Design an enzyme around this catalytic site. Structure first.
Site, PDB file in Angstrom:
ATOM      1  N   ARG C  54       0.900  -1.200  -0.013  1.00  0.00           N
ATOM      2  CA  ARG C  54       0.050  -0.058   0.032  1.00  0.00           C
ATOM      3  C   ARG C  54       0.688   1.369   0.035  1.00  0.00           C
ATOM      4  O   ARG C  54       0.620   1.963  -0.747  1.00  0.00           O
ATOM      5  CB  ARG C  54      -1.018   0.045   1.142  1.00  0.00           C
ATOM      6  CG  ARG C  54      -0.410  -0.397   2.179  1.00  0.00           C
ATOM      7  CD  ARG C  54      -1.554  -0.802   3.525  1.00  0.00           C
ATOM      8  NE  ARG C  54      -2.506  -1.671   3.082  1.00  0.00           N
ATOM      9  CZ  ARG C  54      -2.185  -3.201   2.827  1.00  0.00           C
ATOM     10  NH1 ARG C  54      -0.803  -3.631   3.061  1.00  0.00           N
ATOM     11  NH2 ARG C  54      -3.024  -3.887   2.492  1.00  0.00           N
ATOM     12  N   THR C  55       1.774   1.365   1.033  1.00  0.00           N
ATOM     13  CA  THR C  55       2.608   2.664   1.150  1.00  0.00           C
ATOM     14  C   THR C  55       3.291   3.124  -0.445  1.00  0.00           C
ATOM     15  O   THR C  55       3.511   4.252  -0.712  1.00  0.00           O
ATOM     16  CB  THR C  55       3.656   2.548   2.183  1.00  0.00           C
ATOM     17  OG1 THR C  55       2.807   2.428   3.423  1.00  0.00           O
ATOM     18  CG2 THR C  55       4.432   3.949   2.279  1.00  0.00           C
ATOM     19  N   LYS C  84      27.399  -4.695  -4.423  1.00  0.00           N
ATOM     20  CA  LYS C  84      28.969  -4.347  -4.172  1.00  0.00           C
ATOM     21  C   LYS C  84      28.890  -3.513  -3.000  1.00  0.00           C
ATOM     22  O   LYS C  84      29.509  -2.690  -2.705  1.00  0.00           O
ATOM     23  CB  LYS C  84      29.705  -3.783  -5.178  1.00  0.00           C
ATOM     24  CG  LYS C  84      28.617  -3.639  -6.393  1.00  0.00           C
ATOM     25  CD  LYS C  84      28.686  -4.597  -7.350  1.00  0.00           C
ATOM     26  CE  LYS C  84      29.941  -4.961  -7.826  1.00  0.00           C
ATOM     27  NZ  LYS C  84      29.832  -6.280  -8.574  1.00  0.00           N
ATOM     28  N   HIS C 134       6.735   6.728  10.536  1.00  0.00           N
ATOM     29  CA  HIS C 134       6.081   6.368   9.220  1.00  0.00           C
ATOM     30  C   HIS C 134       4.838   7.396   9.036  1.00  0.00           C
ATOM     31  O   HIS C 134       3.646   7.307   9.439  1.00  0.00           O
ATOM     32  CB  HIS C 134       5.287   5.033   9.453  1.00  0.00           C
ATOM     33  CG  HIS C 134       4.509   4.424   8.296  1.00  0.00           C
ATOM     34  ND1 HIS C 134       4.642   5.021   7.114  1.00  0.00           N
ATOM     35  CD2 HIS C 134       3.853   3.370   8.002  1.00  0.00           C
ATOM     36  CE1 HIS C 134       3.892   4.408   6.225  1.00  0.00           C
ATOM     37  NE2 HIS C 134       3.465   3.431   6.833  1.00  0.00           N
TER      38      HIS C 134
END
Ligand SMILES: Nc1ccn([C@@H]2O[C@H](COP(=O)(O)OP(=O)(O)OP(=O)(O)O)[C@@H](O)[C@H]2O)c(=O)n1
Ligand SMILES: Nc1ccn([C@@H]2O[C@H](COP(=O)(O)OP(=O)(O)OP(=O)(O)O)[C@@H](O)[C@H]2O)c(=O)n1
Ligand code: NA
Ligand SMILES: [Zn+2]
Ligand SMILES: [Zn+2]
Lengths: 310, 144, 310, 310, 310, 144
Positions: C54-55, C84, C134
Site C-alpha cells: 500500500r505505501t 557491491k 511512518h
C-alpha cells in the site's frame, strides 16, 4: 529391572526424585569406571530436526563411549522434507524397526511424546521439543550441581536471563522443586520474567523465591548462578540496551561470591557471560557441558540395560 | 610549572582525564601539554588535571565536559594569571563521541557522526539519537 | 512559499498541528478537484528497501495522478548497495542528482534522516524507517478520522494490538496528542503494552488515557476503533492463544457501537479483524487505504509546488 | 539525419571522435536548455540482467526527462528467459516488436551486439556487457572531464586500481586515445596492471604512458585522478593489505594537487576514496554521476530523434 | 613417549625432518601391518566447516581402521551458524570435553591454531585453514613421493598450476626444503607465479629452482610432476585461454618421461589432467589419495599413543 | 617536578606519548602520573615524557616500546636518584596491541589476543601473525 528400563525419557514431569537420583548415581559410577562394551551390539538413532552442537555431539559421543553404533541426521534431506508427507509418525514407525533407541530434537512441542506412540518398544529420548521439555539438559545440570555442591537440597539458586521463554530454566526449577529447602532468585527483564505458573508451583510446595533487579544484589549468597542468554530478538533493540547491564556477568562481579559458588550456563552464550569470567574458579559452564557425557551415558545404560551390575 | 598562556582543566574526577584526552583528541596539537593523573586535590583525595598552552575553549567546548567532569573547572590563563574561570554547563547536543545503543540504528554502518539531544530530568540526563530518535539514559549510552 | 515547500517529511515529531491541518486541507481539495498536471516534468524516486504494497503503490499512483514520472526499486537486491555493498549515503548522494524528490522506506531506524544529510536540496519523504517513523501513514489516518468524525479534537480513540512495537500507533498517538480533548483507550496484551515514554508524553499534556484488557470493554464509547495486528510471532504460541479472543474483532462485537464509530486498520491485517466486519457500516480500513492517495498526493504537491494553490 | 540517428551504441570502438564530440555538444545543450517533450510518444525498454543503481536509474530518469515511457526489469528472475530458459535472441526478437529502443546491461560479453542482430530496426544501447564495453559510462566520463578541464586533448590523466579487469578504464583509455596530446599514468597493483593490448594501442598512436606504484607519486601533475575500486576479492587478503595504502585516496594526499585537478570515480566506491575527500573542491565523482543524466539524455535524443536539433 | 605424542598438527613449519620421517616410517609399518584395535575406546571429532571429499572421508576412514569412533559435521547446522555467536572458541572448548582429538577444516587462516588454545589437552589436527596450512596433505604427498622414489633427497620436482595461491604447493615446497639436494621447476601463468617469499626461502638454503614456460620443457628430467588446478576464476576467461595449453597435461606429453616419473595431483582436478593420462603407468594421483589413509592413520597413532610398539 | 621513586619514560618522539598511554593502558592505575607532551629537547627537538610513581617495567615491558619509541630512555629513579636507565630493544613477540592486516585471519572475529613474531630485516621489521603465519612489514601493521 531398574526403574528406568525400557522407559521413555520425555518430560521432566515424568521423572521422580528417585528417578533423578538413580540417573545421577549411575552417571557417577560410569564416570569413575567406564563400561565401553556395555551397549555393544546396540544401534541408536540420532535424529535432530533442529540445530545443535552440544546435545547431539555429546549424546552420540556417549553412545560410542558405551560401544553402541549410531545412525541419524542433523537436518532434513530425508523422506519428510524431500518427499513431502512422510509424517513424523511414519518416520518413527520405520526407524524404530532399525534401532534400539531413538534420540530426537524437534521444533514442535510434543514431538518426542508423539514418537513414543509409534516407536513400539523402542525407547525414545527427548533431546528438546519446541518450548516444552529438554530433560537430558536438566539431568546434566543437576549432576553438575550435585557434583560441585555435594547435594540438591537446601541450595541458593539464582537464575538469570530469559526466564519467561527458556525451557531449560523452567525444567531445572521444576526439577529442583522435587528436593527440599532450595531457595530461588529470579533475575530478569520485566518483559521476560519467570512465568506465573512456575511461581504458583513453588508456592504450592512452600518453596521460597524472590525477584531481583541485578545479579550484584544476590551474588553474596548463591551456590549456583545459572545463566542463560537473553535473545535481543525477544526485545526492542532499544529496550534491551537499557537493561542489558544488569543481566550480563563479568569477572569483577564475582568479587564477593562464595568459594563454592559455580557459574552455570546451558550454552551457547553470546555476551551475557564475559570471557574474562572463563579464567575464574567460578566458571563451570564447560565442565557442565562435559557432564552431559556422563548424564547421557547413564541414561542410555539405565534405559537399555535391565540390570546394571556396576 | 605554571604555563604562560593557555587553558587549565582542574578538578577532573579520577579516571576521566584520560577519557577526555581520548574522546576530544586534546593531545592532537603541537602546543605544550601538561597532564596530572591521580593528583592530590585536598578533599576528593585525587583528581586529574590537564594544561594546554596557547589553547582556549568556547563555552560549548567546555559544556562538552559536563557528562564526564561536571564539577570540573576550566581556567583561562593569560600572562601567568588565571584571568577567567568557568564551570561546564550541560550542552544542548553531544556529537561525535557517543555511540547509539540501538544496534539497528543507521548510524552504525554509515559514514555519519553521532548526535544526541540532551534533556535533563528525573535524576539523570536523557540522550536522544538524531537518527533513530530512540531515547536512552546517559548511563546506558556512556556505558559503551 | 507554502510552509512545507521543499521540506523533508521524516518524523511526525517535526510536524506542527498547522502542518497536519495544511496537509489534510490540501488532501481534501485535490480529492474534490484533481490537478493531473500539477507535477508534470517532475521525476520522483520510489526507493523501497523493505516490502510494501500500500505505501509504495499508493505513493507511486499519487505521483502519476499529479503528472510526475517514477524511477526506483522494490528491493535493494539489484542495486550497488545490495551487490557491491555501496553505502546508503552514496546511494542517495547519487540518486539526488537524478530526481526532484525521494520517497524511501528502509529497515533501519534513522535511514530517512540520514538520506536528508546527503540529498542536497532534494526532499526526502519517510515511507517507513525501522521501528521509528511512518509519517505519511499517520497523515492518511488523520485525514480518515477527520473525514468520518468531522474533527480531530475531543475524540474517544481506542488502539488495539501490538502497542509496544507498533510505530503507526506510536505516531498516531503523538499526532492526535497535538489536538485538544482527545482521550485514549489502549487495549493490548500485557507483554505488548503501550510504551511508558508515550504514556508520560500524554501526561505532561494532561491527556486522559486508560488501559483495558478487551475491545468489548470500551466498544460503547469509542469514535475510532484503531486496530493493528497482534504480532503473534512476538509472543509464545500458547501465551497468545490465552489472550487472543480479547484482541480480535468480529461483527457481533459491534452490537453496541456508536453509530459514528469507524474501525480503522493501517493494514495488512491477518486475524484481528474477521471478514464478517467488512460489510458492516463501521468498516473503514479500505476507505482509509484509499485515502492514502489523497494526502500522499497533497504531501507531494506541498513539498514540490512552491506557492500554495489549494 | 544526425550521424547517430538509429545507430546502435555498443562499443567505444565504434564511436569516432566526431561522434563523441557530437554527444557531448548535445549533452551540453540539453543540460542548458531542456526538451521535456522531445521523446514524447516513445516507449523505451530498460532491461537489466545484472545489478545497477546509477546506470539504470539515470537512463530511466533520462527517458522521462525527455517525455518517453518505460517498460523493463531489474533482474531476469521473473522473465521467460530466467524461468523457462528462453534465449536472449528470442527475448529481443519479441521485445523489439514492442519498443522504440532497448537499453540493456548483461553479464555476458557480446550480449548487446547479439541483441543487435535480432532487434530489427530497433536501436540497442549497451549499458554494460560482461568485461567488454560500457560506452555510456565513457560518454559521461568524457563530458565530465571536458566540463571541468575545458578540453579533451593535452591532458594528464591518472587511472588507479583494477586496471587489468576494469572495463570502464579500458574504454576511457581508448576514448581519450582518439584525441591528441594526452598522457597517461597507470597506478595499479602488479597483479592488476593495465593489459598489454591497451599499452600497445597507446604505442601505435605514439601516446605517452607510464607506470607508478603510488597515487602520491603523480599527484602534482594530474588534471584527472580517475579512481576505480581495487577489486580486493581479486587478490589474496594479505597480498592486498601490503599494497593497499598505495591505491587508496584521502584528503591529505591532495596537498600538492593542481587547482584544476578533479577526482573522478565511476562508482560505486568502497574503500579507495575516503569520505574526507567528499567536501574537498577536487571531489567530482557525484557531479560525474549527475552528468550521467545529460549524455544519457543526449544519446537517446540523437538515436531516436531524426534530424539534429541541438 | 614418541616425539609427536599429544602434539598439535597445525603447521608444516612445526614439523621437523625427523618429525616427517617418524610419521612416514609409521605410515609404512601400519600399511604393512594394520592395528585395528589401536585406538579402540577413542572417540574423535571430525569438524569440517568447509567442503571436502578426500580429506574428511580418509581421515574418518583412518579413524575406523584404527578402531576409533567418530562424531562431527560436514557444515554448519549446529550452534555456531544457527544460534549466532557460539564462537569457534566456545565450540572447541565444548567439543574438547567430549572427544580425544579434533580434526578440523576451516575457511579462516589461523582457525586450527586458535582451536589449540581452547582444546585443553585434546590434540587438534589441521585439515586445512584458509590459504595457510594443510599439513596432512603434505604428509601424504611426501609418503607418496618417498614410496615411489624411495627417497626425499636429490629429487627433481616440478610443480604446475596456481603456485601463487595454492596452499598445498607452498607447504610441499617448504617440506621438501627440509631435505637435501632437491631441485624445483615452477611452471605457472605469469599472474599465478610461485610467490617471492618461497623463492627467498629456497635461496637462503642453497636450493636450486627455475621458472619454465611449459611442462614439455622440463618433462625429461622430473621424478615428480606435481599438478594442481588453475582455477579460471583467478584469471580473465580470455587471459586463461591464451596460456591454458601449457599448464594442462595429456598422455602424449609423457612420451619422454623417466620410467620412475610419477604424476601427482592433490585433487580434485577439472581438466589440467586429461583422462587419457589415467591409464598410463605415470598416473599416480589416486594412489596418492589412497596414501592419505596411511599417512593419516600414522598421525592419529603417533598423537594418541605415547609408545607405538610396532 | 622530579619524581621520588618509580619509573620515567624519557625521549618519546612527539605524538607517541599519548599513543603509548593508550596502547598499553598505563593510565589505568591509582598512581600519581605526570605527563609532558611536546616538551623541548635537543636530540630530537620536541619530545613526550611519562612519569609513573611507584611503578616499574620488566625489561620485556620496555622492549615493547621499540616500534614506537626506539630511541627512548626508561629510568628506574628511586629515592630521587636515577637508579638504572634502559634502552628499548626489539622484542621477539608483540601481543595485544597490534592488529592483523589479513582480513581473513581468525584473530578478528574471535576472543583471542593478537600476536606477532618480530624479525628485523633492515629498512623494516617483519611481523608474523601467530594464527595467520602471514608476515607483514611493521609499516603495514602499524600504519593503519
Ligand atoms: N600560570 C598558571 C596559572 C594557574 N595554573 C593552574 O590553575 C589552576 C587554578 O589555580 P587558581 O584559580 O589560581 O587557584 P585555585 O585555588 O586552584 O582556584 P580554584 O579553587 O577555583 O581551583 C591550578 O591548577 C593552577 O595550578 C597553572 O597551572 N599555571
Ligand atoms: N628524582 C628524579 C630524578 C630524575 N628524574 C627524571 O628522569 C630522567 C633522568 O635523566 P638524567 O639522569 O638527568 O640524565 P639527562 O642529562 O637528563 O640525560 P638522559 O635523558 O639520557 O637521562 C629525566 O627525565 C629527569 O627529569 C625525575 O623525574 N625525578
Ligand atoms: Na510516465
Ligand atoms: Zn540511534
Ligand atoms: Zn593473522
Amino acid at each position: 529391572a531398574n526403574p528406568l528400563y525400557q522407559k521413555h525419557i520425555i518430560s521432566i514431569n515424568d521423572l521422580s526424585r528417585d528417578d533423578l537420583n538413580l540417573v545421577l548415581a549411575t552417571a557417577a559410577k560410569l564416570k569413575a569406571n567406564p563400561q565401553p562394551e556395555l551397549l555393544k551390539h546396540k544401534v541408536i538413532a540420532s535424529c535432530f530436526f533442529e540445530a545443535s552442537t552440544r546435545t547431539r555431539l555429546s549424546f552420540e559421543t556417549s553412545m560410542h563411549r558405551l560401544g553402541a553404533s549410531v545412525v541419524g541426521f542433523s537436518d532434513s534431506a530425508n523422506t519428510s522434507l524431500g518427499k513431502k508427507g512422510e509424517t513424523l509418525a511414519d518416520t518413527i514407525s520405520v526407524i524404530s524397526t532399525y534401532v534400539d533407541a531413538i534420540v530426537m530434537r524437534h521444533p514442535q512441542e510434543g514431538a518426542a511424546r508423539l514418537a513414543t506412540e509409534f516407536s513400539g518398544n523402542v525407547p525414545v529420548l527427548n533431546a528438546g521439543d519446541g518450548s516444552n521439555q529438554h530433560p537430558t539438559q536438566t539431568l546434566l545440570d543437576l549432576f553438575t550441581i550435585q557434583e560441585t555442591q555435594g547435594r540438591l537440597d537446601n541450595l541458593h539458586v539464582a537464575m538469570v536471563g530469559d526466564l519467561k521463554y527458556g525451557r531449560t530454566v523452567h525444567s531445572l526449577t521444576q526439577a529442583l522443586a522435587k528436593f527440599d529447602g532450595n531457595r530461588f532468585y529470579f533475575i530478569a527483564p520485566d518483559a521476560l520474567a519467570m512465568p506465573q505458573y512456575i511461581l504458583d508451583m513453588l508456592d504450592e510446595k512452600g518453596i521460597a523465591w524472590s525477584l531481583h533487579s541485578s545479579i550484584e544484589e544476590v551474588m553474596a549468597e548463591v551456590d549456583i548462578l545459572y545463566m542463560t542468554r537473553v535473545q535481543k530478538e525477544r526485545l526492542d533493540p532499544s529496550e534491551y540496551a537499557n537493561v542489558k547491564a544488569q543481566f550480563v556477568l563479568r569477572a569483577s562481579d564475582l568479587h564477593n561470591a562464595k568459594a563454592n559458588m559455580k557459574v552455570l550456563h546451558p550454552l551457547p552464550r553470546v555476551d551475557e557471560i564475559a570471557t574474562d569470567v572463563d579464567k575464574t574458579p567460578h566458571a563451570w559452564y564447560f565442565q557442565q557441558a562435559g557432564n552431559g557425557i556422563f548424564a547421557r551415558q547413564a541414561l542410555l545404560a539405565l534405559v537399555l540395560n535391565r540390570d546394571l551390575v556396576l | 610549572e605554571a604555563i604562560k598562556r593557555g587553558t587549565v582543566i582542574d578538578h577532573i574526577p579520577a579516571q576521566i582525564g584520560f577519557k577526555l584526552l581520548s574522546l576530544f583528541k586534546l593531545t592532537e596539537t603541537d602546543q605544550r601539554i601538561t597532564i596530572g593523573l591521580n593528583l592530590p586535590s585536598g578533599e576528593m583525595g585525587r583528581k586529574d588535571l590537564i594544561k594546554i598552552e596557547n589553547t582556549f575553549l568556547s563555552e560549548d567546548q567546555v559544556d562538552q565536559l559536563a557528562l564526564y567532569a561536571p564539577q570540573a573547572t576550566v581556567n583561562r590563563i593569560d600572562n601567568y594569571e588565571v584571568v577567567g574561570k568557568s564551570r561546564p554547563s550541560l550542552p544542548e547536543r553531544i556529537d561525535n563521541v557517543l555511540v547509539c545503543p540501538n544496534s539497528n540504528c543507521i548510524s552504525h554502518a554509515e559514514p555519519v557522526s553521532s548526535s544526541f539531544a540532551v534533556r535533563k530530568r528525573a535524576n539523570d540526563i536523557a540522550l536522544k539519537c538524531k537518527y533513530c530518535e530512540k531515547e536512552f539514559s546517559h548511563n546506558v549510552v556512556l556505558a559503551n
